[PDB]
Design an enzyme around this catalytic site. Structure first.
Site, PDB file in Angstrom:
ATOM      1  N   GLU A 262       0.843  -1.225   0.000  1.00 55.36           N
ATOM      2  CA  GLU A 262       0.000   0.000   0.000  1.00 55.36           C
ATOM      3  C   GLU A 262       0.868   1.260   0.000  1.00 55.36           C
ATOM      4  O   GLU A 262       0.399   2.309  -0.494  1.00 55.36           O
ATOM      5  CB  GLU A 262      -0.952   0.008   1.203  1.00 55.36           C
ATOM      6  CG  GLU A 262      -1.986  -1.099   1.150  1.00 55.36           C
ATOM      7  CD  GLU A 262      -2.939  -1.102  -0.036  1.00 55.36           C
ATOM      8  OE1 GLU A 262      -3.257  -0.004  -0.554  1.00 55.36           O
ATOM      9  OE2 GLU A 262      -3.387  -2.206  -0.430  1.00 55.36           O
TER      10      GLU A 262
ATOM     11  N   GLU B 290      -1.892   9.082   0.062  1.00 60.33           N
ATOM     12  CA  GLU B 290      -2.270   8.705  -1.316  1.00 60.33           C
ATOM     13  C   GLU B 290      -1.731   9.733  -2.310  1.00 60.33           C
ATOM     14  O   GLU B 290      -1.856  10.943  -2.042  1.00 60.33           O
ATOM     15  CB  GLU B 290      -3.787   8.643  -1.434  1.00 60.33           C
ATOM     16  CG  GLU B 290      -4.262   8.317  -2.825  1.00 60.33           C
ATOM     17  CD  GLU B 290      -5.756   8.061  -2.859  1.00 60.33           C
ATOM     18  OE1 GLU B 290      -6.346   7.838  -1.760  1.00 60.33           O
ATOM     19  OE2 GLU B 290      -6.304   8.035  -3.967  1.00 60.33           O
TER      20      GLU B 290
END
Ligand SMILES: [Cl-]
Ligand SMILES: [Cl-]
Lengths: 242, 243
Positions: free
Chosen positions: A67, A89
């Site tokens: 991730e 992100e």
């Protein structure tokens, strides 16, 4: 507690590039914060035999490494040494706000991916914050600015069933037993089913995916450092999403 | 045409790290593909005075550099030298499928960000594909496997109005005249209003945002290399988002 299964030396060997100049997470994801956060989650890396406990820690670190990965195929020490490089992100195209009375949204806040599991959505910041006794709904960036909270969000995700989805914990520890429906759907116990819980909709039951291979590469490298077998059913290419 | 305004050497100096080992797009984005794609959008880099044409090319390259940046604060040659590092959206959270009668989502296909503008959503792959004569709805990854198509998707985005949003092209060339409503909303002509068009809902009218500063950093470096001024109103910190 998991401190004596995974030493500071082992953690730093596994996540050996997270403090690179090019990693936005440099200095953030500390061994001390991981160990502290783990103490807040009864059963994490303390469920089953020694090999199962090490596979749980390798599975958790492998999925969270994917991730947050800074890796590339030609990277020094290979792509599976570049876990935990990122905090937030990249280039989010949404606020990740799904409004409800059950799951409210905070004015101006964005629930894009943060921390080791890239926790996303007002509803997950809401539920997790409630469980760990921190208001993440109104202070979502705490997941990228407080390392113990950061790890707790990832461990919360790992340890929390979201029916029909079992917890990644219950899967990797073998506590999860597949239903008749799961059996028919090709959903089988092992690392693959953790990929299914995490991002099955986009990654599972659709054949080969570079993202799934990256998840497996981290998991295998961490298992190798622990000197444990991988177990079976590492991919989810043939499992229907939960 | 624009190859006179922006040489191979100028292009490669602007995008001097895109081919570095850590950039997933290494070897893919070419000068020749940019120049070829620019020919399919007349007006691009050929609208207005000399300095306005250079500002348009700098603005287009600056916004697309942000969408694809590999920069970090300590990066060699600074963070505004690391444009065009990425080809495909990292770790996409969604398939970016909004079921539509006009633009049906294709089996096993994902409309995550691709190419210089990080084109997203079945409906944008559909409308863009129609405009450039490519079936991007059924073959979305063409945006990441053919460099000319890749540049064309970004230039399509740059040139295409989506009311109430003007085109980035009309904003940066001064063809767009803010309405009375735009003026009281702080929406004024310049680079800031291109940020507002591109991602104003998430980035604009909310005070300082790191992503806006990054878009400006690329634009200013490219203007510096072109030896042109930036124009006015570079940020959208105090602009209400366009509809
Ligand atoms: Cl089912
Ligand atoms: Cl308004």
């Amino acid at each position: 507690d998991i401190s004596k299964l995974i030493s500071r030396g082992t953690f730093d060997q596994m996540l050996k590039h997270r403090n690179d100049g090019a990693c936005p997470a440099k200095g953030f994801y500390t061994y001390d914060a991981f160990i502290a956060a783990a103490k807040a989650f009864p059963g994490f890396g303390t469920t089953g035999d020694d090999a199962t406990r090490k596979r749980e820690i390798a599975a958790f670190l492998g999925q969270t490494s994917h991730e947050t990965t800074g890796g590339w195929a030609s990277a020094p020490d290979g792509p599976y040494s570049w876990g935990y490089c990122f905090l937030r992100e990249k280039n989010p195209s949404s606020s990740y706000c799904s409004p409800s009375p059950t799951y409210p949204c905070a004015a101006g806040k964005q629930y894009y991916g943060r921390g080791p599991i890239q926790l996303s959505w007002n509803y997950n910041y809401g539920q997790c914050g409630k469980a760990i006794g921190v208001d993440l709904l109104n202070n979502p960036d705490l997941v990228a600015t407080d390392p113990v909270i950061s790890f707790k969000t990832a461990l919360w995700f790992w340890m929390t069933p979201q029916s029909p989805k079992p917890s990644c914990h219950n899967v990797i520890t073998g506590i999860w037993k597949p239903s008749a429906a799961d059996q028919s759907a090709g959903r089988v116990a092992g690392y693959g089913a953790t990929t299914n819980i995490i991002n099955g909709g986009l990654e599972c039951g659709q054949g080969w995916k570079a993202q799934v291979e990256d998840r497996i590469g981290f998991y295998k490298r961490y298992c190798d450092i622990f000197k444990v077998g991988y177990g079976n059913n590492l991919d989810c290419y043939n499992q229907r999403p939960f």
